[PDB]
């Protein structure tokens, strides 16, 4: 595809998301299957005032991806800005 066609396609579809995602069912199922199973993200990073998703991510890792991580030897390190700020910027004590 030529760059100039796909940039009109680009802005149109990006405007469509920024409008419609805020009124459409969130599907975090296969997103989890991506950053845990299908795309193999071992380090996950969250920036926020509070770890609003680290705990529930650990819940799903324990409830769905324990044997999966044991089989493929994946060590997942969940990180957050409020508490694991030292691990994000790599400053151990």
């Amino acid at each position: 595809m030529k760059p100039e066609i796909e940039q009109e396609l680009s802005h149109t579809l990006l405007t469509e998301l920024l409008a419609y995602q805020f009124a459409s069912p969130v599907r975090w199922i296969e997103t989890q299957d991506v950053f845990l199973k299908q795309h193999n993200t071992e380090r996950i990073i969250e920036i926020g005032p509070s770890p609003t998703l680290a705990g529930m991510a650990n819940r799903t890792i324990k409830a769905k991806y324990e044997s999966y991580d044991a089989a493929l030897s994946l060590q997942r390190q969940v990180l957050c800005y409020s508490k694991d700020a030292k691990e994000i910027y790599y400053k151990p004590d």
């Binding site: 396609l9 990006l14 009124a23 069912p25 005032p49 509070s50 910027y89």
Partner: protein
């Protein structure tokens, strides 16, 4: 086999001949050393024929590195690039490069399956043949025995891929500099590599004819400059640029800053002074609406100069496009004895695989003659081993962390010698995390190798936190600890104060119950007409499209207006959303110029990665019209439905959580509430959440239908009549009337309870409150008219590139890597419906 042969060829002259058998064509080659015997003077009876000696040495090395078949041509034109030889990367060469040579891991061992992984450091094997042909020419005259390989570097123009057993690639060498430093001639060969036309690797190497050479006519340095950015902010910048006689006007846009990609050519007449300067370069500066096109160039000559005006000017104003800001303090990466490596006992294997048959590395007599201590190992081998090391010990078995590698051979390594490579987490460049690589001999402690590591990680997803729980002090720690965050927050605060009469920092820092805009003098009245002019145009549900503008209270007469919210103003939409977009308007921030970036990042969150994730990694949210757009959207969305006397509508959110009713309930078990309440009740409803489905179902719509949807799971939670029986045991199509009892009772009881409903937070029902208009569903992107008022305009229409946004976003409204091209068109068009992209889906017109 013979390795030394001293013999008397003609009367009174010696022919010490150093023999080398392991060569390109496994054919022994002699290196003669003519020696006049002097019976007359017995104090020093051996004079050495110094004339043509370098010629003989180059003859020997030419036969060694290129074979007897190819004739020796001393005359090599320096200006023209040195053509290599087109080879085909076979699976065999990659299979048999490694016997005692280095990189070995899970993917670098004898296993079945398919294509075996490999490193890119064997690009000089392709390169070597032509790279070394630039140290031979007559103009660069030096002693090849005293030649030491000083450094080698690889650049990362990644038009190519990693080795997959079958690539087809060629060679292209070109001499850049021949310097005369006190250490001797510094030959600079940056011979690049072409895979049918497109460059793949740069490959720079330095050789050093150790000694002292004074020939300066045959000395030059054609360096190419980087995209160097100057620093300015003024209108004097035009005057300065005009004052530069070398610069030539080749654009018609105002000047405030440069990012030249230049290139120059030096000619030395002495140690430091240049005989002449040649500069041609290119000109750069920003263009309109982030839509850049072609540019022009420059020109310069000089003579007997101590510096280059152009490059020194560009540098002096500032550093180049530097995607490398060094991290504050160092921590270890893989330090210890589990990063040590013993040098190979011998050097013939790497010599035969790479083609460098320099006897200094293998032949004992050659190493002894060059006065260097023993047959030192290849600098190339050391570089290859270290480049394989940046992937091997600091990583848990992933081969996607081998990249551009710069290296220099400050020391020497004897064979079968142990080396402690140190690798400390210090610097940071644009993803490929800069780590030091310094290879020091363990017992002498002297360094041998110096470079910067570029090891990646596996892919990741920068998650975020935001709307729905936002608190006081939201993102103020970064505001008080970061210059860039301070800049963005201050700019937005100034724009809100100067255009809307309220500080957003005051809303965020110390959350007030209510705030008052005042419409005072010229500034206040220019604030008031902002509110007077802007407001939604939503269809009144009593007829056709009612063109209207409801702020009501604010008009010409009023001199103040109070924003009131009981729980908090940060809870109010018009202030929670701009605050949200601002507080995560800085994540990439310093890592942007730092290099912590792992392999593949997608900006995301928990459905709040579309409003706070896509400027640091996607630059969509422009600069300062962002806050206007978000505040206008907040107001339009907030007053999009009729409020009652107490200020609450018949619409909102509610959770219908599946986890609590039973573990049995699944997508094939209860995916019926949405399409069994909209059809009969003639109301509006759609599910907002099955993100963590089987554990979390939430929905939005008019409040009565929300109650009806909840009192399906609620009534089937204490009684537990499974819907699996209703759905899969008997049939699917036939069962479209079983609901017209079990939702009928509720579509009656909900009317019985008072019309403004406060939905209870039960076991399987956990509503999220503080939301009046139904979003995340089907009434805050449906016929809701003025939501996309600003959607083909001020927002940077030309900035958005498919390159990043495609693949670097993961769809919360789907699944995996959001394709921002045609493939995804009918995903925001099925569960939410649209009309805007109906044209692009059908009416393609003249896009070609």
């Amino acid at each position: 086999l013979p390795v030394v042969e001293i013999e008397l060829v003609k009367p009174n002259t010696i022919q010490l001949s150093l023999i080398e058998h392991r060569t390109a064509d496994t054919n022994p080659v002699a290196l003669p050393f003519l020696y006049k015997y002097n019976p007359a003077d017995g104090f020093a009876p051996i004079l050495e024929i110094m004339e043509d000696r370098n010629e003989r040495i180059k003859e020997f090395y030419w036969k060694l590195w290129f074979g007897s078949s190819v004739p020796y041509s001393n005359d090599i034109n320096v200006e023209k690039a040195i053509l290599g030889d087109e080879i085909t990367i076979s699976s065999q060469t990659i299979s048999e490069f490694t016997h005692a040579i280095g990189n070995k891991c899970d993917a670098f061992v004898d296993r079945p399956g398919k294509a075996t992984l490999a490193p890119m450091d064997f690009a000089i094997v392709i390169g070597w043949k032509a790279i070394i042909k630039a140290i031979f020419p007559k103009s660069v005259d030096g002693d090849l025995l005293k030649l030491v390989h000083l450094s080698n570097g690889y650049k990362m123009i990644t038009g190519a891929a990693p080795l997959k057993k079958g690539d087809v690639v060629s060679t292209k060498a070109e001499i850049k500099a021949v310097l005369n430093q006190p250490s001797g001639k510094l030959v600079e060969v940056v011979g690049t590599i072409y895979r049918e036309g497109k460059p793949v690797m740069e490959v720079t190497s330095q050789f050093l004819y150790r000694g002292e050479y004074n020939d300066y006519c045959n000395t030059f340095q054609k360096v190419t400059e980087t995209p160097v950015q100057v620093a300015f902010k003024s209108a004097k910048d035009l005057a300065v640029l005009r004052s530069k006689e070398w610069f030539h006007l080749e654009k018609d846009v105002q000047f405030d800053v440069l990012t030249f990609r230049c290139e120059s050519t030096y000619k030395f007449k002495s140690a430091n002074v240049y005989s002449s300067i040649k500069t041609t370069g290119q000109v750069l500066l920003e263009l309109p609406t982030k839509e850049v096109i072609q540019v022009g160039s420059v020109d310069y000559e000089a003579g007997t100069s101590y510096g280059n005006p152009v490059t020194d000017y560009l540098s002096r104003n500032g550093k180049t496009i530097e995607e490398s800001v060094i991290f504050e303090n160092a921590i270890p990466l893989s330090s210890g004895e589990e990063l040590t490596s013993k040098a190979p006992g011998t050097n013939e294997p790497y010599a035969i695989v790479s083609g460098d048959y320099n006897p200094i590395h293998v032949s004992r007599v050659f190493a002894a003659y060059a006065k260097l201590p023993g047959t030192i190992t290849h600098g190339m081998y050391s570089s290859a081993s270290i480049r394989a090391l940046v992937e091997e010990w600091a990583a848990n078995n992933v081969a996607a962390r081998v990249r551009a590698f710069k290296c220099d051979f400050v020391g020497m390594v004897l064979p079968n010698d142990t080396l402690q490579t140190t690798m400390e987490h210090v610097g940071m460049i644009n993803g490929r995390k800069i780590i030091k690589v310094e290879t020091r001999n363990v017992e002498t402690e002297l360094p041998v190798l110096i470079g910067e590591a570029e090891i990646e990680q596996p892919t990741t997803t920068y998650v975020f936190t935001g709307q729905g729980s936002q608190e006081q002090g939201m993102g103020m720690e970064l505001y008080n600890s970061s210059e860039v965050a301070r800049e963005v927050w201050d700019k937005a605060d100034r724009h809100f104060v100067n255009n809307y009469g309220f500080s957003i920092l005051d809303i965020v820092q110390n959350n007030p119950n209510e705030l008052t805009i005042h419409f005072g003098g010229a500034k206040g009245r220019a604030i008031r007409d902002n509110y007077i002019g802007m407001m939604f145009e939503t269809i009144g549900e009593d007829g056709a499209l009612k063109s209207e503008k409801i702020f009501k209270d604010i008009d010409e007469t009023t001199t103040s207006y109070t924003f009131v919210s009981p729980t908090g103003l940060l809870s109010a939409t018009q202030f929670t959303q701009p605050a949200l977009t601002l507080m995560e308007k800085a994540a990439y921030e310093d890592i942007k110029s730092k290099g912590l970036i792992p392999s593949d990042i997608m900006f995301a969150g928990h459905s709040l990665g579309e409003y706070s994730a896509l400027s640091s990694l996607a630059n969509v949210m422009p600069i300062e019209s962002l806050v206007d757009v978000v505040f206008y959207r907040g107001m339009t969305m907030q007053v999009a439905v009729p409020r009652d006397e107490l200020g609450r509508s018949n619409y909102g959110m509610v959770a219908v959580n599946p986890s609590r009713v039973s573990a049995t309930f699944d997508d094939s078990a209860l995916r019926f509430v949405v399409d069994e309440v909209a059809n009969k009740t003639k109301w509006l409803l759609e599910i907002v959440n099955y993100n963590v489905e089987n554990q979390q179902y939430v929905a939005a719509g008019d409040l009565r239908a929300l109650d009806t949807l909840t009192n399906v799971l609620n009534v089937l939670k204490i009684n537990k009549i499974d819907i699996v029986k209703l759905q899969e045991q008997m049939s699917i199509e036939k069962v479209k009337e079983h609901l017209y009892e079990i939702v009928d009772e509720v579509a009656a009881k909900s009317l019985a309870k008072p019309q403004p409903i406060d939905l209870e937070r039960g076991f399987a029902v956990i509503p999220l409150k503080g939301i009046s208009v139904p979003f995340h569903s089907s009434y805050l992107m449906s016929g809701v008219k003025p939501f996309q008022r600003f959607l083909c305009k001020k927002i940077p229409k030309s900035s958005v590139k498919p390159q990043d946004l495609i693949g670097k976003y993961i769809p919360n409204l789907t699944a995996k890597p959001f394709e921002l091209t045609k493939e995804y068109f009918q995903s925001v068009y099925d569960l939410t419906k649209s009309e805007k992209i109906k044209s692009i889906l059908d009416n393609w017109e003249q896009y070609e």
